[PDB]
Amino acid sequence: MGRILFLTTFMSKGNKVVRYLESLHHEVVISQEKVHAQSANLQEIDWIVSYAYGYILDKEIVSRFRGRIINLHPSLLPWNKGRDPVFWSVWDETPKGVTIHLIDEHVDTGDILVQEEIAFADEDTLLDCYNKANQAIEELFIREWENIVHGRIAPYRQTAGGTLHFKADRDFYKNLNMTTVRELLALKRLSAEPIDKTFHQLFEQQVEMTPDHVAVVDRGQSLTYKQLNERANQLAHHLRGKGVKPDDQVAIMLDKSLDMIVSILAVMKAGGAYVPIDPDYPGERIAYMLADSSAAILLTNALHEEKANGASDIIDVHDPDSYSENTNNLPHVNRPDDLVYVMYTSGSTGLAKGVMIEHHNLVNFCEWYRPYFGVTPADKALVYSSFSFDGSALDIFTHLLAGAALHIVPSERKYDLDALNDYCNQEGITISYLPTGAAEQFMQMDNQSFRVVITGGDVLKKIERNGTYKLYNGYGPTECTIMVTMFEVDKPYANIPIGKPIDRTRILILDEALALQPIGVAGELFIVGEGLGRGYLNRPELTAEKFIVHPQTGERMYRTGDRARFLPDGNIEFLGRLDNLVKIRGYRIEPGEIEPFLMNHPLIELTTVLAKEQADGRKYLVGYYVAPEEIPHGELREWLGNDLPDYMIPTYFVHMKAFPLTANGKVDRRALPDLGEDYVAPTDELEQQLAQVWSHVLGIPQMGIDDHFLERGGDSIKVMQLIHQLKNIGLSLRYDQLFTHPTIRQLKRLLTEQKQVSLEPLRELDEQAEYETSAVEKCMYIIQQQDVESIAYNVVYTINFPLTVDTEQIRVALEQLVLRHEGLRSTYHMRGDEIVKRIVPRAELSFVRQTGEEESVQSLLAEQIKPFDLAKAPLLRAGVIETADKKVLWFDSHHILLDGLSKSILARELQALLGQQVLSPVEKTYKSFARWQNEWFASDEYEQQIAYWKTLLQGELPAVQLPTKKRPPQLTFDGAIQMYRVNPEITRKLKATAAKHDLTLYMLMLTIVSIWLSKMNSDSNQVILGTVTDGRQHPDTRELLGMFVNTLPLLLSIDHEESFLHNLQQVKAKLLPALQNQYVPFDKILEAARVKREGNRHPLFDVMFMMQGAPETELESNMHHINAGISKFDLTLEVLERENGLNIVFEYNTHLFDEGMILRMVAQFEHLLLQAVHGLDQQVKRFELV
C-alpha cells in the first residue's frame, strides 16, 4: 500500500519494476518531465523511485523526501558516477556492478542501500552489457524492495573514490556500441594516450664515441666523424657570424658530395634550418623554392651559382674564405622546437607547399630507427634519394647517429640498377632506403651485401627477390617526418600491410565526423605524436585545416587524406587515397583493388591500373602490366572474370617492358601511354534492333553482339523487362531461353517469327463506391482478422538525417505522397461474402515529434508500433525522433500496402521531394490491376500454371525438419535476429562466379542455402523452402504502391555425389519453371497440395529465403528495416546487397531455437559458403559444417 512516483527515461522504461510495485497494490505515477516544487506530481507521494532520470531535483524536494528518494544506478558506485556508466566501466576497466542508493544533496553520492557485482563476457557487445546491467538492477530492486520499505536495510556511506563522467564525454565513441568487449579494449590500446635534445647535440655525442670511424665515402674521398665535425664547425662559425639565428632558413644547392654533408651539419650547428634545392630540378621550381623560402643565404658552388639568378647572398663552399680557423663545437643556442629543415611536397609552382620539420621530430625518428634495425657502426649506408626529398633525411641522419658510413651514390650509377648492384656487392652495402618503384626493379638483381632494404612511398606489390635481405614496407607523409609506421614483409599478401606505428606515435581511424572507428572498419587515417611538423610555410589557413585540434579530445592531429583500417593483429592496411575513388556504371571503385588480381597471373610481374576520362566525361579504366610477351585481351578478361564483376574489368590493357619512374623513384603514372576490343557492332536489322533494346534495359550505350547479358548487370528483373520489350516488337522470348543464349549473337537465332504482338495497356476503372480486392489482399485481410491486435504484418523502417534537415519539410513530403498514391488512401471492408476496397479523396497522416537520447531510440520506436485498423486510412504512420547528433525519421505501415518494391518507390519519391523536384502524376492504380488479374484467373494461361503445381505438389513432398526444441501447441511469432556480413571481396567473387556460369546471384545463393539445409537434415537428397517474387505481373505496375508479392514453394534436389557447379545448374533447372508459373495465388497452391493453414506448423515449408537487389537511391540505402520481435516462420534468411557486400539476416522463432543453436547455425553457414566459393569443382559431400 502506498503511492509511488516513478521518474525515468521514457514511458516503458522499467516495465518489470512498475508491474511488481503495482502487483503489491502500490499506485505508480510515471513521469519523465521535470518536477516543480509545487505540482500535482508531488502532492500525496510516499516514495520517489528514479531510474535513468534525466533531471536533477530541487533542494527543497530532496529535503521534503529525506530517506524517501531511491535511485537505480547501473554501476558499482563510486565508480562511474554520472552518464553512460556501463560504457565507461568497460572502457576504463573499473569494477562492474549495479547500485541502489539514496538521493542526497550531493548527486550520485547518497548512502548505499544494496550493491552487487556483475560480469561482462568478452564476446558481449556494449549493447548487451547495457541491457544485462539494466536487467540485473531491476531484478535487484524487485528482490530487495520489501527489505527497504520495512526498514530491514541499514544504509551505509559510499567510499570516496571512483570516477565521474558527463553527457558529452562519450561523443568521440559513438560508433562503438555494437563492438565486443574484447574488440573495444583492443581499440583502446591503439588510441588512448620526452625529447630535449637537438640533432647536432646527438651527432657531436656520436663523434666522441667513434671519432676515427668513416662517416662519408665518395669515389675514394673519405671523411671520418671527427673530420666531418671539424669542417662543419669551421663553416658554422662563419655562418653564425653572418647572422644565422634560430628558425632562420638557409638554402643549399649542391650535388651529392662531401660538401653537401658538411653544409647540412654547418647550418644546424650555426643554429638555422636548411632548405635543400636539387640543382637538377627545372629552373622554375628552383626559382619558386627560393622565392617562397625566407632564406637570405644560399650555400652553393660555381657550377650552380647561375641557377639562383642572384636572388640571395651566396656563400661559396669551395672558397676557403667561407671557413673559419676555429674547429671547436659551437655553443648551443637551439631548442628542440626549432626548425631543422624545410622540404616541399609534389605539385606545380605556387601549389607545392613547404613543410616545416622540427628538431624533436627528427630526433624521435632517428632514435627509433637505430635499435629497430640494429644499426651498428659496422654498417654501410647508401645515400640514394635526392636531398630535396625526405627519403634522403632517412639516408643521412639515421646512420650518422649509429656510427655507420654513408656512401655518396656516384651519378653514373644511380639510374643503372645493374651497376648499382655491383657497387653494393663490391663495397659491402648492408642497409638502404629505396623508393617503391626503384626497389621492385632492384629485386631482380643478385645481391649478397644487403641485410635490410626499406621501401615505401607507394603501394608495394612485388616481394619475390634475388637475395637474402629483409624487406620492409614503410609509410608516412612528409608532413609527419619521413615515416610513422613500419612493417616487415614476411610472406605474400594480396594487400601488404604498412605495419605498426613508431615511437611516441598513435594512428587513429576516424569517420567523416571525426569519430573513432572500430577495429576492422575503414576510415581516414589521422596521425598523433612527436612526428607532426610545425606546418606549411607561409600558409596558416591550410595548416589549420590539416593540423587540427580535435573538437572532443583536444589533441593535435594531422589529417592525411589516406584511407586505411586496422587489422586484428594491430598492423595497418592502406586502402588508397580518399580522392582516387571513381564511379563506373554506378559503383564506387578503388582502381587499386584490381591490381593484385593481375599480379597473380603467372606471366605478369608488375601492374598499375589507372582511371581516365574521355572528352565526353565518361569514366573508364585502363590496365598496364609488365610481362615478357603480350597477353591476349581475351585471356585477361577471362582471368579477371574469375573474381571481379564486369564493371571492375579494365576496358583496355597495355603491355610494356617496364614502368617509367619519377625522380623520387615512384611509378610515373602520368608518363604511361594513352567501345572496347571485344565490341562486335551489329550487322543485321535484327541484330541492331536487339542491341537497342538491350541498351535500354541494361542502361548502357552502344551494346555489342558478344556482350553477355548477366555479366553486364542483367538479373531476373531485367530479364523480365527484356521479354516485355521484345513483345513490343512481336518477338516472343521465354524466360529460360535467355539463360541458354545470353548474348545477342546467340539469342538472334530464336527470334524469326514476328507474331504474338499483343500490346495491352492496363485500363482505368470507372468511379465506383466500392472496388474488388486482389487475391493477395484478400489473404492478408483474412489473416489480420484472425488477430486484429497482431503487429506481425507491420513494416517499420528508419532513416537517419542530419540535424540541418527541416522536420516540417519531411512531414509535408510524406503528406504529398499520401495524396499521390491511392494505396495510402485505401480502406478494406467485408461486404457479406466479398472483401471490398473503398478509396477516400483525402486522408490525415499521423506525424509525431519526439526528442530523446540515442540509447532510447529503439525503445521509443517500439512504443509507436501498434496495430492498423484496415478499415481506416492512411495505412501509414510516421514521426521524427531528434537526438543530440541526428534526426531519426521512422514510418510504420502494413504489409497489405507496402511491399519491397513499394518501399523503393516511396524512398525514391521522398528523395525527389526533399530535393525540391516536381513529380509527374501516377498513371495507373492498384485497383485496376486487381480487376485485370481477377479476370486473368479465368483464362487458359492460368489453367496451365495451376496445372504445373498440381503435378509438382502431388504425393511425396519432402519434409525439412531442422533440429529444434519442443514446438509449442499453436503457432507462435516471437522472434529474434542474428546477422552475418559477407565482405566486398567475397561478394565480388560470388557475383563473378554466378555470371561466368549463366547464373544469377540469387540462383547461386539459393543453392548454398539448399546445401546448408540438406546438411542439417541428414544430407537429404531433396529439400523444400519458400521464397518470394515481386509479383508485378502487368508491366504497367512497376511504379504503384501496393502488395504484389507472391509466395512460392521450391522443391530442390541436392546431389551430394556431384560438384557444386553441377548442383548449381540443377537448381536453375528447377527454379525457372517455378518462375514461369509464379502467378498462381499461394492459396491455390495450397489446394494443389491438399494442405490447409492449421496446426503449429506453416503448411508447406518451415524455412523462407528471400533476397533484394542493391538500393536504387542514396535515401533507400540509408533506410534500415526494424524487426519488432516477430518471426513469420520458423526461420527466415534474407540477403541484402549493401555497400558492395551482403548482409545476411537470420530471423528465427525463439520458442524453437535458443541463442546457442542459432550462433552455431550461422557459423556453419559462413563456413559452408567459404568452401563453396573456393571449391566450385568440388563434390558437395566434401563440404563440412564444422
Ligand SMILES: Nc1ncnc2c1ncn2[C@@H]1O[C@H](COP(=O)(O)CP(=O)(O)OP(=O)(O)O)[C@@H](O)[C@H]1O
Ligand atoms: N608504403 C606506402 N604504401 C602506400 N602508400 C604510401 C606509402 N608510403 C607513402 N604512401 C603514400 O604517399 C603519400 C605521401 O607521400 P609524400 O612524398 O610525403 C607527399 P607527395 O610527394 O606529394 O606524394 P605524391 O607525389 O604521390 O602526391 C602518403 O600519403 C601515401 O598516400
Ligand SMILES: *P(=O)(O)OCC(C)(C)[C@@H](O)C(=O)NCCC(=O)NCCNC(C)=O
Ligand atoms: P533472379 O535475379 O535469380 O531473382 C529471382 C527472384 C528474386 C525471384 C526475382 O524474380 C524477384 O522476384 N526479385 C524480387 C524479389 C523481392 O521482391 N524480394 C523482396 C520481397 N520482400 C518484401 C518485404 O516485400
Ligand SMILES: CC(C)[C@H](N)C(=O)O
Ligand atoms: C620515406 C619517405 C620518402 C615517405 N614514405 C614519403 O613518401 O614521403
